[PDB]
Amino acid sequence: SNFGVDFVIHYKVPAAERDEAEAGFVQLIRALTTVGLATEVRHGENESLLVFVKVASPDLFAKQVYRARLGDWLHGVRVSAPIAQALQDEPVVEAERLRLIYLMITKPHNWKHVESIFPLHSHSFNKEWIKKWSSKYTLEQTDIDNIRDKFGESVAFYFAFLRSYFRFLVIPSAFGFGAWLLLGQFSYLYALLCGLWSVVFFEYWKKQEVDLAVQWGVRGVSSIQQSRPEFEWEHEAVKVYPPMKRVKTQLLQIPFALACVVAAGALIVTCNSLEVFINEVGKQYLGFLPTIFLVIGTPTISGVLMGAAEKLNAMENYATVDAHDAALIQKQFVLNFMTSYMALFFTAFVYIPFGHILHPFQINPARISNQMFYFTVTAQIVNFATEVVVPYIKQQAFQKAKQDHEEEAEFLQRVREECTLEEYDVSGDYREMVMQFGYVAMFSVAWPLAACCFLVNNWVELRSDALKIAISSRRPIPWRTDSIGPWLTALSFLSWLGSITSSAIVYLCSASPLKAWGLLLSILFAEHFYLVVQLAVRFVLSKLDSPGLQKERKERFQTKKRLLQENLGWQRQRGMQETIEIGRRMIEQQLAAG
Amino acid sequence: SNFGVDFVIHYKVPAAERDEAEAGFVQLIRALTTVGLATEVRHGENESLLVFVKVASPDLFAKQVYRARLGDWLHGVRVSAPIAQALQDEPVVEAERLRLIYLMITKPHNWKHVESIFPLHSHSFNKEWIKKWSSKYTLEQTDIDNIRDKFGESVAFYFAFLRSYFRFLVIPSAFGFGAWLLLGQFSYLYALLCGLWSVVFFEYWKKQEVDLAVQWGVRGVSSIQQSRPEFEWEHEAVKVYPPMKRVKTQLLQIPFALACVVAAGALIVTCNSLEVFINEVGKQYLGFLPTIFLVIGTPTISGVLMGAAEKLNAMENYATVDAHDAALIQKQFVLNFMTSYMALFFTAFVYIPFGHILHPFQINPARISNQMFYFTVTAQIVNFATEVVVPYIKQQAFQKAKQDHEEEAEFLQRVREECTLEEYDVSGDYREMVMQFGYVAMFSVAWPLAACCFLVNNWVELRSDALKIAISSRRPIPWRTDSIGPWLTALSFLSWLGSITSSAIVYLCSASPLKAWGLLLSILFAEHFYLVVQLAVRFVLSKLDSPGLQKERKERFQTKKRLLQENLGWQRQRGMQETIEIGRRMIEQQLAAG
Ligand SMILES: [Ca+2]
Ligand SMILES: [Ca+2]
Ligand SMILES: [Ca+2]
Ligand SMILES: [Ca+2]
Questions:
Q1: B563 touches chain A (CB under 8 A)
Q2: How many CA within 13 A on the CB side of residue A443?
Q3: How many other CB atoms sit within 10 Å of the CB of residue B509?
Q4: Which long-range contacts (CB under 8 A, 24 or more apart) does A108-114 make?
Q5: Which domain of life does this protein belong to (chains A, B) (predicted)?
Q6: DSSP letters of B429-467?
Q7: Which of B468, B486, B502, B496 is nearest to B198 (CA)?
Q8: Which residues, at least 6 apart from A30, have a Cβ–Cβ distance to it below 8 Å?
Q9: What residues does the ion ligand 4 have nearby, CB within 5 Å?
């Protein structure tokens, strides 16, 4: 039970240069209290001063709610519009309570010591929520709407990308179990059910997204963009950066990908040649070490390159934040692409079909159905042990490593422990959950019992991430978006690529020489077939109008209906009898002489 | 100079059943004059009664203009909104003058003798317009906007699809002349310039369309649909037809296409075998007759099948008129597809590559560069002679075939000659102008001097159609639409198909056997390349925002801006000085003991 605290600002004051710190502290307190929010000061841990803020006069906040609530009517966020009477008719949920206060602390008014503004956690909510998700098997729609209020939309959107990827993994699980029991291995009919399913999930998601963004009322938030504060500009007109200076910096991404093809490629050369060096030249030390080299070497080489990619993203300047996450993810996607697939491509397209010709520079049948075992059993239980147990143990032994006070002796002892954690972001979870999908879309026909093991690691990741957010990471500052950023696009590229490599595989590792002809014809057939079932499920799933969408078109019409119903509410042979007389006259005149 | 007449209704009364005709005539006159428009009666020609209507009280018409002008604000046709004051601020153009009167004559109120309602022509406008288009080479944007006012939007839209297809034919003309002079015949570099150009024209058109539909203010008219009056319905809910009865009728289209593959295919078997029958077994009668068999046999076999296709479209019932032209065109497209290409496919994919194997059931090099000469010189000058000269001669000799009267002796003699003509539709012109594009998109690399002859038959068709509308067809009843109906889609299919067949051709009629390998690899490369340059010109031509579009986003904002600016216009350590005092105290308290 927090003491009504809405935010906590850190304001670290070090030993050196501490004389520009007290005046800057007064500059912080005055600028905070002119906005209209109270302040308190406690101790930190070593040299810091945890400043506590909350809103004080509820009328200024209730008008502040209105000052953006009828800002959302302006830019076409929602259609409807409600004199400070937005509290009883439709209340303020805990998204809009904590976002607008965060919009009052950082503002364009129309600081090199503040470490990190961060909200607090309510632990009376956590032991209900993490328990009640673990006694259910499925999850209802109304339980995701109980995670929107307390965390935001962009944290609540990832849990709806998981739930609607759960229940579409049950199709190629069961029809993947059949192709492990009934049909033989590497068969073509699995390579089109996995070809068909990777459009039905991808297109039923893009229709469920614009429905579920209507019901929350945040449909058009991607149209508005706001300025990132670290933007630079030479001369204003709205500000502008010289765009030809961005071409000189964006081109350095090509020596990043050129470093990416050689770095993650260097590990598989270490993996392949150490496999032979321990084979020919401790017998049980030979079969346990190339596993333990690949689980401790890979997330270090993916750490130093992504940290180099995060540095390249800040040097390449960007204007808007929506164009900032559209370039961090692409420079991070190619990095995690060549790390979690170039151990698998080189086995299936070079090692197993060309195992005769590469030999003077035999072939064993136990590698492609064994390396796919790696990325499905032992590279997930080393991941679930790392994503939860390692930070929980690292923070528990660190708690023992230490060397008005009525209830504040414990309330400071909760919030001081918070600020040494990391801010949880749903960028990394989407990057994993979009990389894991690949295996069951490109390299799945090489071992058709891959879906039925991924469906048990998404009934735990649906509650592992619910555990990680509340025991090992401070609450994310709530944001709003409509779709899953740029992830949806690079989800499409993991569909077409999955439908090509898969077709080539259903032909090589199965005509006597199996090369040139059947291979190219099979890939062309499986590619053209994809580009035809990407239209029919763009045609069946486009004549089905959603219920939500009705709530937009009616209220657009009904408001437009109500708006104008509260504001308005020569040859002259004249004589209509004269005209019909000659009409009955002329038609008999034409028929009394013929 | 017409006498203010806005429409002419025919009302043909025959010999038999003429007793239900005078009472029905009075039923016509009364229902016309209760709407509020005057009536006059003249003679017809043989048994008819040309009824003349015009609007009488300009206040009822000026409110009728408003009754749909603020109907267009309701359904989101345009954003802006102007008490019968829509005459001086923005006047009524001659589209909206003649459409609304036509919307008063046919109405849902909220007749088996009336032949055809049709507007009249102003011949003081025609001799200016057809002359002034023939003294210019190019055409300015402001001259197409002088054809919108007098004819509509859907007649004025076809002249903007021609003008922006004129000036993009100048690219593969000049770079087609080079591939006839510099480079050799059947070269691959022409097969990608024709591959690139068929996206740049197709994507620059779809961007110029939403611009030019903004400036006319008819942007969203395709969203509204209205009921076709000949619709049937069993039980209402808005009415509804049983949709499973439509599946029983729509399936009969498959025996139409199955009749289409055999009928137009039967003519080329007649073309091929009569060529040999006159070759072996009058020397100048041998080289002139297979031309004269193909120009008089083809538009008869395309007449009886399209008339069968028009009968199938009326039997298959449809609700809305927008779903009526989306099924007449598709059933007419496949008919004109297999007639103007299956004489050309069978030559280029069977005759010239497989000329050895088919021979016992030699090969000559003079057929593919001679049959492409047919569809470019002699099948256009037989078409321009048919589209203009034949109906003008047929109507001139028919004028000699005949067997209050102050100025009405000549004014009846103009309007009586009108009603025996045909109602001009821009469906057929789009069908031709979309079929002719194919030759320069699929079969163009087989004879790279095809564009430079199509660019002189579109400087005449740009004024032949301007001649046909005013000398040989009554004025079309003005309509409104935003895009070129369903033509734009089946324009896209003529792009991908053009990029495949063309790639196969650049490999067959040019490895020694030229088969299986290079062929499939070349088509795959030219198809994948297409699907990559369909993204870059969906990315360069999508970061360029149009000027028109600015006029929508500002006036949406400025109205929304103006609308709300004309209606509105605990731990308590209180004392901001107390808070900053302990703040300067604690940071020294933490640094007077360390
Ligand atoms: Ca995981
Ligand atoms: Ca994870
Ligand atoms: Ca023509
Ligand atoms: Ca024509």
A1: no
A2: 23
A3: 21
A4: A108/A227, A111/A24, A111/A28, A113/A11, A113/A12, A113/A13, A113/A21, A113/A24, A113/A25, A114/A9, A114/A10, A114/A11, A114/A28
A5: Eukaryota
A6: HHHHHHHHHHHTTSTTTTSS-SHHHHTTSTTTHHHHHHH
A7: B496
A8: B576, B580
A9: B 432
- Asked whether the beta carbons of residue B29 and residue A580 sit closer than 8 angstroms, the reply is yes
- Residue B13: count other Cβ atoms within 10 Å of its Cβ: 21
Q: Which residues of A define the annotated binding site for Ca(2+)?
A: 383, 387, 429, 432, 461, 465
Query: Resolution of this PDB entry, in A?
Result: 4.0
Classify A55 as helix, strand or coil.
strand
A389 — contact with chain B (CB < 8 Å)?
no
Q: Is B383 annotated as a binding residue?
A: yes
Number of neighbouring beta carbons within 10 Å of residue B553:
12
* Phi, psi angle pair for A115, to nearest 5°: -80, -65
The two tokens of residue B130 are: 């057809």
Question: How crowded is residue B211: how many other Cβ atoms within 10 Å of its Cβ?
Answer: 13
Nearest chain B CA: its distance from A6 CA (Å): 13
Q: Which helix (DSSP H) or strand (DSSP E) does residue B38 occupy? A: strand B37-41
Query: B172 CB contacts (<8 Å, ≥6 apart)?
Result: B193, B194, B197, B440, B444, B451
Q: How was this structure determined?
A: cryo-EM
Three-state secondary structure call for residue A298:
helix
- Contact between A312 and A331 (Cβ < 8 Å): yes
Ligand with an atom nearest the CA of residue A430: 2
Q: How far apart are CA A283 and CA B523, in angstroms?
A: 53
Q: Which of A559, A78, A70 is nearest to B76 (CA)?
A: A559
Q: What are the DSSP E strand ranges found in B80-147?
A: none
Q: Between the CA of residue A328 and those of A308, A437, A480, A487, what are the distances in Å?
A: 11, 20, 18, 11
A72 CB contacts (<8 Å, ≥6 apart)? A78
Checking chain A for breaks where C and the next N are over 2.5 Å apart, the residues before them are 82, 110, 237, 281, 361, 403, 510, 569
* Cβ of residue A511 closer than 8 Å to a chain B Cβ: no
DSSP codes of every residue in A470-489: HHSSBPPPP---SS-TTTTH
Q: Which of B382, B377, B385, B387 is nearest to B453 (CA)?
A: B377
Query: Of the candidates A250, A161, A232, which has an alpha carbon nearest to the alpha carbon of residue A431?
Result: A161
Tokens of A124: 């009376």
